[PDB]
Write a protein that binds this ligand. Sequence first.
Ligand SMILES: Nc1ncnc2c1ncn2[C@@H]1O[C@H](COP(=O)(O)OP(=O)(O)OP(O)(O)=S)[C@@H](O)[C@H]1O
Ligand SMILES: Nc1ncnc2c1ncn2[C@@H]1O[C@H](COP(=O)(O)OP(=O)(O)OP(O)(O)=S)[C@@H](O)[C@H]1O
Ligand SMILES: Nc1ncnc2c1ncn2[C@@H]1O[C@H](COP(=O)(O)OP(=O)(O)OP(O)(O)=S)[C@@H](O)[C@H]1O
Ligand SMILES: [Mg+2]
Ligand SMILES: [Mg+2]
Ligand SMILES: [Mg+2]
Lengths: 272, 435, 317, 293, 160
Amino acid sequence: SFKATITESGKQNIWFRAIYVLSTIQDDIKITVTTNELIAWSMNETDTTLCQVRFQKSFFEEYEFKPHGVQVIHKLYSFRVNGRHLTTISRKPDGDGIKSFTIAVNNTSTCPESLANRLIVVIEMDSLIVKEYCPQFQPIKYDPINYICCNSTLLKNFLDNCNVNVTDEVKLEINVHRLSITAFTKAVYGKNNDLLRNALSMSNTISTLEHYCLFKSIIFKLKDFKNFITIGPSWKTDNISLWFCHPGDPILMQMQKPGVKLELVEVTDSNI
Amino acid sequence: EQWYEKFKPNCLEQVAIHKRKLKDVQEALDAMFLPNAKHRILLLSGPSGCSKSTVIKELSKILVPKYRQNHKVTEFRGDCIVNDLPQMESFSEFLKGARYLVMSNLSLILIEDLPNVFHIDTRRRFQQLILQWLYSSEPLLPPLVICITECEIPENDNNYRKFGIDYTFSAETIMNKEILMHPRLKRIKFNPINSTLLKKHLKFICVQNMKMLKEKNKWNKRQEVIDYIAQETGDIRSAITTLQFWATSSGSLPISTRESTISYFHAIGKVIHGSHSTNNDNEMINNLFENSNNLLSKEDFKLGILENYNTFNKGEFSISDASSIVDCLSECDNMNGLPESNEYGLREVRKTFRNISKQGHNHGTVYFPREWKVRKLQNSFKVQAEDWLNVSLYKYNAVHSFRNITLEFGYYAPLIRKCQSYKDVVDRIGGPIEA
Amino acid sequence: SLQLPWVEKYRPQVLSDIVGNKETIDRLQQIAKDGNMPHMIISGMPGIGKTTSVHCLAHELLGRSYADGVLELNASDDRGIDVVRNQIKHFAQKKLHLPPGKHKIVILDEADSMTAGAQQALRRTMELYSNSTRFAFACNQSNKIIEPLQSRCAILRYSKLSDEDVLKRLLQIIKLEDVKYTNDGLEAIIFTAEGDMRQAINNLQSTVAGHGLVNADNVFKIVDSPHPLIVKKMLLASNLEDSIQILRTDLWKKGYSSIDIVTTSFRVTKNLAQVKESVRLEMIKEIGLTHMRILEGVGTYLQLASMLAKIHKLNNK
Amino acid sequence: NKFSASTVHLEHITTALSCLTPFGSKDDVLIFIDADGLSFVRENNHVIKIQLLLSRELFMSYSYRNETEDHMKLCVKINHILDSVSVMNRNSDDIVECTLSYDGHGSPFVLIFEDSFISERVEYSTYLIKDFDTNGLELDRERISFEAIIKGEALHSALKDLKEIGCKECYVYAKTEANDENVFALISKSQLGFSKIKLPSNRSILEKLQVFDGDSTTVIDGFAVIGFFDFTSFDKIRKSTKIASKVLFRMDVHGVLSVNILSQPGIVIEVCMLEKESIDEAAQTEIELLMET
Amino acid sequence: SKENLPWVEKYRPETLDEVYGQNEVITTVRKFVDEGKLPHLLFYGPPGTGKTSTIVALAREIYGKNYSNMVLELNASDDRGIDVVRNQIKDFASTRQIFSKGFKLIILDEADAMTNAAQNALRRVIERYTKNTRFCVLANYAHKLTPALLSRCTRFRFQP
DNA sequence: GCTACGGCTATACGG
DNA sequence: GATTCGTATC
Ligand SMILES: Nc1ncnc2c1ncn2[C@@H]1O[C@H](COP(=O)(O)OP(=O)(O)OP(O)(O)=S)[C@@H](O)[C@H]1O
Ligand SMILES: Nc1ncnc2c1ncn2[C@@H]1O[C@H](COP(=O)(O)OP(=O)(O)OP(O)(O)=S)[C@@H](O)[C@H]1O
Ligand SMILES: Nc1ncnc2c1ncn2[C@@H]1O[C@H](COP(=O)(O)OP(=O)(O)OP(O)(O)=S)[C@@H](O)[C@H]1O
Ligand SMILES: [Mg+2]
Ligand SMILES: [Mg+2]
Ligand SMILES: [Mg+2]
């Protein structure tokens, strides 16, 4: 039915990094096949974060799809695949580059049990070595203010300078004069005012930014923001969009690529 | 599907739970959904198949869509292994994202699949992460419900390093006293399902299978099998599974349910007063050793026998019987924990209490041994004696052995120092001696 | 040199060839013909047909899908918390197109030796994926499986195999192999088996290999009478001079160790009938003191003679 | 001394030692001393054996004055040597001239490291030799079913991919098609599923694949040999293929794979591996279906 | 070389004809070898009765000069824990026998000192690879062996 | 062409 | 298994 092939380098680095991030978010990555795009998404167990990566048909050399599991809305075949398993197939080996990365599923009467509920991914190295994999998949059903347009790299350096174990929450205080974000963690006080957990408040300020349309204070997690931030800077050829409304409302993070759509939704702190 | 999955309750009236227990769970849960609740965590503890989560889910179904500031629970999945996360950090990232499940995103977080607590480091991490939630400074936090099933850990890990978690999977051996005696933690212990509710629910399931029951000529003997299952087990899931297995059968295979483990005080009472099921002490003792060897081998059981054998008739039996019991226990203590030692001590205690047993005996209440209190007072004595020794080393250059301390230094030395001060420790080492 | 032992050569391949426990085997046949297998725990003494029943049920329930629908894990394989969390989870998550009423089977042989954490993760494993795969635990002592796991399973207890099922299977094997026998030889083989099919087949094989004709003399010159039944005879003697005679001739000069005799005496006393409880506890005490003396280094015949003398002294009084 | 060998290219004897560690990290290593060269043989669980050989041409001086016996056998611990030559290698940039020595049975194995200022001398205790003989785990040279010559880099990359995908069990497919096609694959059982790595039929990676009917003489086409191996044993050659220019694969009907690794003179590595029972006979047909797929 | 040995080691039997006292066990194992079908054996008896001398001579008779690569002898002097059973014994039983003498032999001397976890794990290695390997268990105390392991072994008693 | 340092990985150890 | 207090029901 569906068959997609990637035959470029940066096109493969962005795919591998997106798959790695979606595997870090949830154990099983969610992939849906459309006739015009490839939607790979993943949601946390707490249902607080949702990262979705959309690969258009122009991102692949060939994007055959014959739907004639399946769910009509336009037909849509969705399936579940293990993230830790797909992140090693798409891993770029050291010493032998990838020439053609083909991903396909053949759920037809012509297919035997080797292709029944098992995804087909083809890797052809530049050394002509052909590596075959058959990851098992499970059919499923798809489950589908102020504006900030800051530069991704200025965020990138500070975010990489933040450890997830010692810093968990990020504050984003947007002002018309300047925008300062601070990666902080709170302190937990014990029985006799004992320090169960410390408080680190590493911070950085970026002067006001391109499209700081306020038309504030927001708090959300950090372990997925860093990953979604470093997804895009893998296809070297870089502006992130922050759409948040209220403390209790989710924040939307979007990035752009020539053939890749990046979306991240996170639940924000309802504290006012 | 299976009858315990297809005949699951739809509302709270179909849940096999006691009325008072349901009332105490309901009021506590309703109180924990208030803006600033006094209780932060609700620890439900009890045996398996006691509707501990089967009541939490159907209570959340009517509670969460009442306080959601515009419907179900968020359960922790321990088996989830994500790419970039240490295994011990899996619960931390769950509790760090679950705390965002507050107003307009409200969800009761239920922890029934506990993390791996048989490994010490992650058990300690679990404890300190719960303590970081009880002592959290967040103005608003979601209600947290933790269900722990009390089950005896079977005989494994032949190392002598068996800890409490290596003997019994209970809230006492998973949590610590700081969590268990916290002002913001509410514990509601659950009891096994009584015979009446089990009978009523197994009869509702039968009238929902009446056609198939009658076709296999099993509809008049349904009363006896429901009664036998209700009398034999207190597990609703096991009861429904056994009923389904008996109904779908077409032969005379015998009704067999799961096996339950006795309590420590239950085993003590069985040794002392005997069991009503059988009047043969040999059979009862053999079954107790076969099914509960993990408890009859611990020395605290032989200590509990010595602590509670005086409760047979409130202490009104012959001194010869008590002397025989304690002499047998002392002789068993010299057998180096052989399997023949406990099997002789318990048999002798039961034989002694059987002959003197008469009708109308008003027995007493058993208690746990105080050996641990003595062992902690011994450590306090050690600390105070070493304080005496080191404070009596530089002021007056002198060495003295601890054996001489426990005989003449702690009554005489304070009696000299306080008498020299009535005109440097001055108190009796280890506190005064009473009686 | 390529001939298999009769234990493995005549291992049943269908549920109809499994003798003993007629009701349970019939129920397993109903499960095999219907398909809706529930979670089950099979327990019993070793060598009565627990494993060959689960494997035959899985075969008769899957057939051509047995290669991809059965995951057999046992004590010889690593069954830690990680295997349950990864291998068993992926097998349960696997979607296989099986006939109607048919489910995947996870045969966890020797489930009594599994660690507590793996058993606790198995709770979630069966709770999430009960609609696709079913678990078949086989063990020897069912209390070693935690109660939360037993609550989700249908316990099937296999009883000891009687002297008639053993004779039926032995006669089938004899007819298949064409060996010479007589009635008393088969009776002796069954008597030495003590409810064990595997031991009965091994003893018959040894007798046929050694001599060829299965009579009482050739059976008893290579197979020995069960030493619990000799210890019971020695401990139930009336006067001391023949209990000492038994302990010497049938236990000491035959090669049995003193610690073995002492350990067998304890189990015999725990199940001895027609003896008063006061007598039984004193016998247990004497056996325990003798056990301590053997364990401390003194494994002599005099220490066993003294134990029998004390037992007779407590018996006559 | 009955044996003395001197060298300056200690990197050769260091890579030779680094090829032996995969076969256990703390056990006995057998050293065979003859006039042709110095060989180290290591056996693990009687299922796999590795035999490197250091020729006399790798040493300036190779005396071997032993005359009563043609070959000398000594058994020493590998952990003593590895723990020793590690701290010696702290200043390996110095011009070190290793001197191996052995004076016979009962004498220690001497390893002198002289830097023209310091002469470190290490004597290794020799232990009794076990019962197992290393000639048992060798392929029969008249029963070869397939003979594949593969490059070192491609095999190393394939082994590293099998390691990264887990690969609890491994399969080896070798079929020569009638027209011109040669098929060599390394199929793996792992957590992923059923994965296959196909070596190219081009003559730079797969120089020569030749399938016989169990006599190493009758070349036939259309039939494939399949070898079921445990990747625990199959991964022991991964550290040896890292310095391999060409690798020779040979297997007989008895289920023994003889991996021949030649490095560039240089060290000659011979690894012999045993094949599993494959008691289940459906994976064979599924392998055939997968390769035809 | 053999004259500088203690008499208890110098006069160790090398063939089955030099083992005296145990006539019924030898006359059974010899027929077992002659037919070529050797079951899983269990040797029990007092110390110094000839169990090890019997099993080593039997393996030499079956395997001849291939005793080195065809017999895995593990005793109390080597670690025999759960990992040893799950790795060394299992890969010795699973691999092929280079078509030398048909079946492999694993001799577990002094198996009474073996932990219960290892003896329980060995039960599914004894009955799974029985087509290519056979297990012999030598013990002096049968109370330290699990009942299942005793069940899957043919017991031969070595009399004084 | 060469080197140092960060990331990946195998292994001994804590409880 | 024992005692004591508290219900629910026939
Ligand atoms: N009338 C009923 N009342 C309660 N549970 C029922 C009833 N009918 C069916 N069940 C099922 O019985 C099971 C009882 O589950 P719970 O007791 O809530 O879980 P649990 O107490 O944690 O038991 P463990 O420890 O997980 S085995 C559930 O699967 C219910 O769906
Ligand atoms: N009812 C039976 N009918 C025929 N053969 C049987 C029967 N029960 C056991 N056997 C034989 O016993 C041998 C193996 O039996 P198993 O089922 O593996 O033993 P088991 O009952 O599983 O005990 P454990 O706990 O696994 S050692 C084979 O040779 C079978 O032929
Ligand atoms: N039947 C026999 N015939 C001749 N020599 C024997 C016989 N039995 C024992 N021996 C001698 O006794 C020595 C020790 O016997 P082994 O067979 O090695 O040990 P064992 O008899 O199995 O007792 P354990 O259980 O190992 S202490 C042998 O090396 C022989 O020299
Ligand atoms: Mg539950
Ligand atoms: Mg079995
Ligand atoms: Mg011996």
